[PDB]
């Protein structure tokens, strides 16, 4: 299982920057932010989407909880952790978990470029093993799971949430983005529905704060077709590996989004007080 994930994300980050943007954010974007000046890049749409999730989780309210420890589960190429270090300058502990050694090497380089290595800790760790993270005595105020659970089988997703719940502070937020199938059954010719997806979280003990389609189907399609155009512009001789797979997937996934067969969801849950 884990070797397949490692193979998927082992490619040169410089090639990925040409495909998905300089920030290497890989869970779509929003094209509706009044602060965005068109044309809207993948970097811009991705960050504005993440900012909208933090807004929906209550972090623009002046009396939100003090963000003292952060976890990013499946932290990709590390820009969400960089953004969060800038967003919460008083947060002196941000932890990233990832199975991809190539992505973690890039994360360490990005964080070192910004002098963030004393605030951001990196762990080569499966999501199911978050119970192994150091200092259980300091719970997490904010946990990010951005485009990761779609890579998990149902047993792994349930096991990971069971491991995560004790590590979240009461009143702390888990801010999730994932790619779901809108209906349980489609014509014959890691599938999760919204009801199933939310029930894993509430069964684990979390309380729903907000769940909605975000980005919109047409915004996810825009992100995919802009990434496809980037790959075709920057690899005119032909793409290889995961970037060729993304180029092909962009059209098929965009069609499914236009037909409303699949959507991307923002899912925010909190740990309740005992």
- Tell me which residues touch ligand SAH (CB under 6 A): 5, 9, 25-27, 74-76, 80, 97-100, 103, 126-127, 146-148, 151-152
| Residue 14 binds to Na ion (criterion: CB under 5 A) | yes
Residue 132 Cβ vs ligand SAH, minimum distance, rounded to whole Å:
12
Taking the least distance from each CB to Na ion, the nearer of 14 and 185 is: 14
Q: Provide the 10 A C-beta neighbour count for residue 182.
A: 16
Count of residues in the chain: 274
In the list Na ion, ligand SAH, none, the entry touching 26 (Cβ below 5 to 8 angstroms by class) is: ligand SAH
Q: Please state, in angstroms and rounded to a whole number, the distance separating the CA atoms of residues 180 and 183.
A: 9
Fill in the DSSP letter of residue 136. Answer: T
**Are 172 and 271 contacting, i.e. CB atoms less than 8 angstroms apart?**
yes
Taking the least distance from each CB to ligand SAH, the nearer of 132 and 258 is: 132
Taking the least distance from each CB to Na ion, the nearer of 104 and 214 is: 104
Residue 224 Cβ vs ligand SAH, minimum distance, rounded to whole Å:
14
Q: Residue 115 burial (CB < 10 Å; 0-12/13-18/19+)?
A: exposed
Q: Which two tokens stand for residue 224?
A: 């995919």
Q: Please state, in angstroms and rounded to a whole number, the distance separating the CA atoms of residues 201 and 115.
A: 35
In the list Na ion, ligand SAH, none, the entry touching 5 (Cβ below 5 to 8 angstroms by class) is: ligand SAH
Taking the least distance from each CB to Na ion, the nearer of 14 and 155 is: 14
Helix count and strand count (H, E) for the chain: 9, 7
Nearest Cα to 234, choosing from 246, 222, 220?
A: 246
* Interface stretch with Na ion, choices 7-15, 77-85, 140-148, 176-184 (CB under 5 A): 7-15
Nearest Cα to 44, choosing from 273, 226, 268, 245?
A: 226
Q: Residue 191 burial (CB < 10 Å; 0-12/13-18/19+)?
A: exposed
In the list ligand SAH, Na ion, none, the entry touching 101 (Cβ below 5 to 8 angstroms by class) is: Na ion
In the list Na ion, ligand SAH, none, the entry touching 76 (Cβ below 5 to 8 angstroms by class) is: ligand SAH
Nearest Cα to 127, choosing from 108, 111, 151, 91?
A: 151
Residue 15 Cβ vs ligand SAH, minimum distance, rounded to whole Å:
16
Angle, vertex CA 46, rays to CA 55 and CA 34, nearest 5: 60
Among positions 79-118, residues that touch Na ion (CB under 5 A) are: 100-101
Residue 62 Cβ vs ligand SAH, minimum distance, rounded to whole Å:
27
In the list Na ion, ligand SAH, none, the entry touching 119 (Cβ below 5 to 8 angstroms by class) is: none
Taking the least distance from each CB to Na ion, the nearer of 126 and 264 is: 126
Taking the least distance from each CB to Na ion, the nearer of 100 and 270 is: 100
Taking the least distance from each CB to ligand SAH, the nearer of 46 and 194 is: 46
Q: Which residues bind Na ion (CB under 5 A)?
A: 6, 14-15, 100-101
């Amino acid at each position: 299982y884990q070797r397949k994930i490692e193979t998927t994300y082992e490619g040169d980050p410089a090639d990925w920057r040409k495909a998905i943007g300089e920030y290497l954010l890989f869970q779509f974007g929003v094209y509706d932010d009044p602060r965005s000046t068109p044309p809207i890049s993948l970097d811009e749409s991705g960050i504005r989407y993440f900012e909208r999730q933090l807004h929906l989780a209550g972090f623009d309210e002046p009396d939100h909880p003090s963000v003292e420890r952060i976890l990013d589960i499946g932290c990709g190429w590390g820009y969400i952790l960089k953004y969060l270090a800038d967003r919460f300058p008083h947060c002196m502990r941000l932890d990233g978990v990832n199975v991809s050694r190539e992505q973690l090497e890039y994360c360490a380089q990005l964080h070192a470029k910004h002098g963030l290595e004393d605030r951001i800790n990196l762990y080569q760790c499966n999501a199911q093993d978050v119970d192994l993270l150091p200092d259980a005595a300091t719970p997490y105020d904010l946990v990010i799971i951005r485009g990761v659970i779609s890579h998990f089988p149902n047993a792994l997703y349930e096991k990971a949430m069971k491991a995560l719940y004790p590590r979240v502070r009461p009143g702390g937020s888990v801010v999730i983005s994932d790619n779901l199938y809108n209906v349980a059954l489609d014509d014959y010719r890691h599938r999760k529905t919204p009801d199933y997806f939310a029930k894993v979280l509430t069964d684990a003990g979390f309380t729903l704060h907000d769940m909605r389609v975000l980005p919109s189907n047409i915004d996810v399609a825009r992100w995919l077709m802009d990434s496809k155009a980037n790959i075709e512009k920057h690899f005119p001789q032909g793409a290889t590996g995961t970037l060729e797979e993304l180029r092909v997937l962009a059209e098929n996934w965009s069609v499914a989004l236009i037909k409303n067969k699949v959507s991307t969801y923002s899912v925010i849950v909190t740990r309740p007080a005992a």
